[PDB]
Amino acid sequence: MKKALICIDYTNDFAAENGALTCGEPARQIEDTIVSLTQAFIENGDYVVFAVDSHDDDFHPETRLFPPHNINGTEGKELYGRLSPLYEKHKHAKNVNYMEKTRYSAFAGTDLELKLRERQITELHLAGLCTDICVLHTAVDAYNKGFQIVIHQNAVASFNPEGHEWALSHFKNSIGAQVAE
Amino acid sequence: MKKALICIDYTNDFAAENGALTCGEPARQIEDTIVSLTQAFIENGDYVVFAVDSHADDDFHPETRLFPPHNINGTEGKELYGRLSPLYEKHKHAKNVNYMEKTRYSAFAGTDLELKLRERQITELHLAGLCTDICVLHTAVDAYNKGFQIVIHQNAVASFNPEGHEWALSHFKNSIGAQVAE
Ligand SMILES: [Zn+2]
Numbered sequence: 167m168k169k170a171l172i173c174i175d176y177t178n179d180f181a182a183e184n185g186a187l188t189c190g191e192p193a194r195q196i197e198d199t200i201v202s203l204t205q206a207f208i209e210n211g212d213y214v215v216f217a218v219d220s221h222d223d224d225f226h227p228e229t230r231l232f233p234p235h236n237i238n239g240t241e242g243k244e245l246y247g248r249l250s251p252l253y254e255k256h257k258h259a260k261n262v263n264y265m266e267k268t269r270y271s272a273f274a275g276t277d278l279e280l281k282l283r284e285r286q287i288t289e290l291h292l293a294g295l296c297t298d299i300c301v302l303h304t305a306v307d308a309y310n311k312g313f314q315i316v317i318h319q320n321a322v323a324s325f326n327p328e329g330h331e332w333a334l335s336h337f338k339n340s341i342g343a344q345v346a347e
Numbered sequence: 348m349k350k351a352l353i354c355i356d357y358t359n360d361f362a363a364e365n366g367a368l369t370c371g372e373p374a375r376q377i378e379d380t381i382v383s384l385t386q387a388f389i390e391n392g393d394y395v396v397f398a399v400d401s402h403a404d405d406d407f408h409p410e411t412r413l414f415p416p417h418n419i420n421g422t423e424g425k426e427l428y429g430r431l432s433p434l435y436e437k438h439k440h441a442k443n444v445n446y447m448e449k450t451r452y453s454a455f456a457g458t459d460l461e462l463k464l465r466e467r468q469i470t471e472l473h474l475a476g477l478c479t480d481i482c483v484l485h486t487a488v489d490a491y492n493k494g495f496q497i498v499i500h501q502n503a504v505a506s507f508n509p510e511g512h513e514w515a516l517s518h519f520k521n522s523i524g525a526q527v528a529e
């Protein structure tokens with residue numbers, strides 16, 4: 167179908183050794199496949215959204231739960247590893263969108279759905295962090311919005327291995343997505 | 348602040364022994380707690396929504412072909428389980444009681460739940476029912492994105508998957524910021 171890739175929260179703070187909210191080894195371990203995945207989408211001309219947690223704010227629900235992270239302007243928010251130059255190489259491309267988000271789901275309070283419908287996109291490929299938090303919530307919205315969904319299981323990770331497994335099974339058995347190797 | 352209870356898919360098909368999609372005993376073991384909870388809300392005059400899956404002749408529904416028919420209209424599989432059924436029948440006339448059919452996992456999706464919550468100025472959403480890591484989870488994701496305070500009644504939710512159940516309760520507490528009440 168018409169395809170888009172949503173590349174979620176692959177930042178320093180979520181992957182880096184001293185990431186302010188780091189997921190650690192599982193997150194860095196996917197670096198190579200998510201970079202290839204994204205590059206491939208970009209080069210084939212498919213729509214690619216870098217959906218990135220963005221924080222300035224005692225009104226944000228997460229300020230109760232978590233340390234400061236993915237703060238606007240800081241190195242923690244930058245895309246991790248080889249994904250940062252991939253993006254910098256392509257940030258002007260028509261089929262590349264850098265989209266700041268304020269909740270776990272890439273859809274919530276954003277214009278992602280608007281952009282996807284403009285482009286008549288019908289299949290949404292999901293990659294990034296975490297499998298059972300931002301990828302999950304995104305997939306829940308995608309599901310309830312009627313999109314076909316592809317989870318790239320070697321391009322997602324979580325700190326919690328059980329959550330990771332649980333999520334992949336949820337995507338397969340409840341959401342009816344395709345979980346791709 | 349103003350409270351409502353969303354009592355999710357506590358039906359024969361999801362709880363009974365012979366249920367088309369039963370979670371089995373753990374769904375049956377919460378009957379007393381979920382009935383006491385729901386009755387407490389009803390009698391206190393708080394808003395209560397029985398949110399019930401209603402489907403399976405539509406090859407357009409994502410669920411058909413990929414799940415056996417369940418909570419089908421007219422069938423006693425759709426009936427509330429156990430003592431929840433006579434509680435509902437006794438109060439179904441009440442202004443603070445609503446029966447709401449839903450067609451996806453989340454109680455918000457394609458329903459007028461949010462409309463009704465706004466009208467009643469509900470600020471805090473209490474969730475109970477089945478399954479912890481499916482319908483309860485999807486309802487909670489939506490509730491979270493729509494800005495509600497969320498209370499999960501741990502002893503009034505259950506899943507057919509024990510690992511999913513535990514995972515979900517930590518998710519609600521730690522990611523969604525819900526109160527997980529015991
Ligand atoms: Zn954040």
Ligand SMILES: [Zn+2]
Binds near residue numbers: 400402410417
């Ligand atoms: Zn169903």
